[PDB]
Design a protein around this ligand. Structure first.
Ligand SMILES: Nc1ncnc2c1ncn2[C@@H]1O[C@H](C[C@@H](N)CC[C@H](N)C(=O)O)[C@@H](O)[C@H]1O
Ligand SMILES: [Zn+2]
Ligand SMILES: [Zn+2]
Ligand SMILES: [Zn+2]
Ligand SMILES: [Zn+2]
Lengths: 5, 261
């Protein structure tokens, strides 16, 4: 799933 | 014209107000979420709030000294005299920042306190032609300035994978154990609306304040350069975001050096 970091 | 669909999206929970205007279409102030200025949980998380477990300084000064423990924990204190980051601070591999806390012997206004002093920049939420909602500044912001924090809802790695809305998650990679997330889809502050830009004026920094439970850093955005008034706020989401979302739409960040268009 798409995660910002 | 500039239609003021709200005077303060935060309903007075922030030090300065954050208005929402819309000058491109019909969409009203966004309200499909609960604004919160700090992080919350839905499932109980065993955060270590045991005071005797805090590292802390005993500075008889204002933690300018080369002896401040909390500055040592950040390798050094990176805040200048008016709480901006030093030029020697590494925006590419930001270090962990440990701010002074209530166990320290120092005064509430020692030099090593910044993120914890709340929002200090006049910003505003507004409608953009290309990406829907966006956040932008109304003042000049020098470099190294703590702009705002990514506040949301603490959830486990696991729960992260099972949510149908990955557009608002922020990965909080504790290397030394379980990895956690901030889901700012249902509860979140203003940073949920900050868009991705490939030449980002903002950089996330992992910051510890009232507790030093490494599983849960807090995410602080500092400016990487001067941000002129009116400029949209943006930060790099990373590859994992585009490996995934990229398969569905591309980056209208509009940069010449745009890496995800
Ligand atoms: N450079 C970009 N190009 C296209 N879409 C973007 C870009 N940056 C962010 N987004 C979009 O915005 C989402 C990230 C949100 N945190 C940003 C606020 C959002 N635009 C909103 O209207 O709520 C993504 O899931 C995308 O839909
Ligand atoms: Zn100190
Ligand atoms: Zn301290
Ligand atoms: Zn201090
Ligand atoms: Zn781009």
């Amino acid at each position: 799933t798409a995660r910002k970091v | 014209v500039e239609r003021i669909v709200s005077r303060d999206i935060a309903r007075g929970y922030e030090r300065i107000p954050i208005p929402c205007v819309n000058a491109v279409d019909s969409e009203p102030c966004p309200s499909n979420y609960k604004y919160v200025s700090q992080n919350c949980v839905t499932s109980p998380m065993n955060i270590d709030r045991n005071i005797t477990h805090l590292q802390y300084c005993v500075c008889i000064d204002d933690c300018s000294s080369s002896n401040c423990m909390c500055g040592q924990l950040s390798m050094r204190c990176w805040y200048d005299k008016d709480g901006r980051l030093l030029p020697e601070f590494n925006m590419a591999e930001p270090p962990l920042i440990f701010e002074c806390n209530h166990a320290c012997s120092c005064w509430r206004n020692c030099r090593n306190r910044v993120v914890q002093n709340g929002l200090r920049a006049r910003l505003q939420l507004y409608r953009t032609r290309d990406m829907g909602w966006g956040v932008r500044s109304l003042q000049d912001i020098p470099p190294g300035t703590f702009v705002c924090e990514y506040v949301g809802e603490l959830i486990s790695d696991s729960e992260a994978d099972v949510r149908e809305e990955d557009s608002y998650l922020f990965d909080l990679d504790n290397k030394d154990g379980e990895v956690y997330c901030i889901d700012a889809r249902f509860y979140g502050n203003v940073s949920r609306f900050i868009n991705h830009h490939c030449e980002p004026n903002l950089v996330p920094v992992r910051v510890f304040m009232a507790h030093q439970d490494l599983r849960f850093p807090r995410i602080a955005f500092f400016s990487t350069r001067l941000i002129e008034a009116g400029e949209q706020l943006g930060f790099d989401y990373g590859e994992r975001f585009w490996d995934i979302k990229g398969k569905l739409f591309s980056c209208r960040c509009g940069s010449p050096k745009c890496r995800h268009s």
